[PDB]
């Protein structure tokens with residue numbers, strides 16, 4: 282159930298935080314408490330054939346999933362309102378900007394520091410996967426920071442518009458997501474599961490370390506072909522300062538066969554995320570991110 | 581190659597006619613002639629990773645295809661300008677609005693009259709397929725009229741944003757288009773050809789006669805499933821006045837196997853389009869379009 286009231290009776294609506302093509306997000310403040318939040322206005326789809334808005338069934342799904350999740354690295358749902366046109370989700374305010382845009386301003390970044398941000402993401406996704414929840418839209422712009430003005434920023438995974446609970450012995454197939462970041466089973470219209478998220482993590486890791494994107498072609502047709510042929514390389518132009526541990530981590534994620542891809546638990550336990558001896562920790566410490574190419578590709 | 585000049589040096593730019601995600605159209609008039617056209621501004625994509633704009637390569641392809649086609653049922657290109665941000669296609673002015681919107685305002689409509697509009701579409705597609713051009717975006721909003729105010733409106737296929745030349749021995753695969761109208765090979769990411777256009781015609785015919793949509797589900801996920809298993813029917817609620825010839829036409833278009841689907845020439849020869857005896861033509865004349873459900877689903 283959604284509250285059948287005028288949201289603006291209870292919240293002062295403020296400046297825009299961004300706007301997808303299916304939602305508009307704005308700062309707000311609950312009048313009764315004075316606490317700040319984000320108000321995510323979702324336009325309800327008015328007809329079955331319509332390409333505008335979202336069908337209330339999928340909004341309900343997003344809400345149902347948000348309600349199950351409480352974790353430091355996952356956006357927190359506060360409330361839901363509804364009128365004739367929109368459903369409005371009141372969500373924890375995540376104002377710190379994107380992770381990538383924080384990194385783009387660093388003057389130095391080691392793999393050690395890099396892995397510490399990546400672990401925050403793995404913690405969030407581990408939590409969802411344990412609850413059998415697939416995010417299905419992991420990509421830099423859904424990786425945000427609470428506050429970009431503290432020494433080590435806190436990551437929050439946002440936007441559960443495509444998230445889905447995965448049911449055993451129940452097949453889920455659909456096509457969606459940003460081509461650059463989708464797993465081969467999405468392009469190939471094959472059974473989807475928690476594995477797609479793991480693929481995305483590899484692609485995001487690849488970009489964070491190097492500035493390059495593994496499968497991105499000159500056109501979408503090219504991107505999809507690269508994905509499905511699992512066609513990519515570790516160009517020395519961009520990867521010459523990247524550790525073998527890093528590449529091994531990536532290599533084990535960018536795999537077509539869903540059952541051979543590292544799970545979230547295995548990713549957390551990979552030596553590049555969780556060194557098992559001093560030697561590995563030193564190597565990681567001595568490997569640097571390609572800030573120069575990273576900054577360049579992301580501006 | 582595109583004229584590297586300021587479009588408005590040569591045209592008076594008028595009112596906005598329409599706009600999509602990747603183009604905006606304004607009415608215009610060439611100064612030297614006084615003749616009117618439509619100026620289609622297409623924003624150039626500025627980076628490979630960017631999701632905004634169209635890459636020049638695909639704009640070139642669209643232009644390249646339009647320059648090859650002169651046929652009374654196909655929009656006719658006049659010129660192309662280019663500036664810093666945009667490529668501007670100067671195109672024949674098609675002002676009569678959408679075919680569907682005109683049908684929806686109709687009092688009565690027989691299958692004989694319906695096949696008359698469908699034939700116009702088949703003529704345009706036949707011309708295209710002869711030249712090995714696949715349109716790849718056959719759907720209602722891309723089927724316009726020159727003048728809705730004459731007894732028998734003149735149909736014009738528009739929007740070659742997705743059109744592609746099909747090369748023998750060259751595999752083309754991609755994912756695109758409107759879910760309601762895409763063939764199974766698009767959804768399954770299989771080799772694409774001229775056959776996809778024939779599927780689309782099937783769907784459009786289904787809708788035109790009945791007002792209902794063969795594969796339309798409650799969500800995209802469902803639409804994609806229906807398409808792939810070719811799951812549809814002729815609900816008597818809507819098809820009770822529709823001839824067996826019409827349904828046979830649709831049946832032979834909505835087939836999964838690309839090799840068994842009717843080609844464009846076979847469509848053109850189908851008895852529902854091209855009756856061989858007085859008996860068939862009577863039946864057509866006596867079967868009525870479901871204007872009532874049609875108006876409802878589209879207006």
Ligand SMILES: [Ca+2]
Nearest residue numbers: 469470768769
């Ligand atoms: Ca497939």
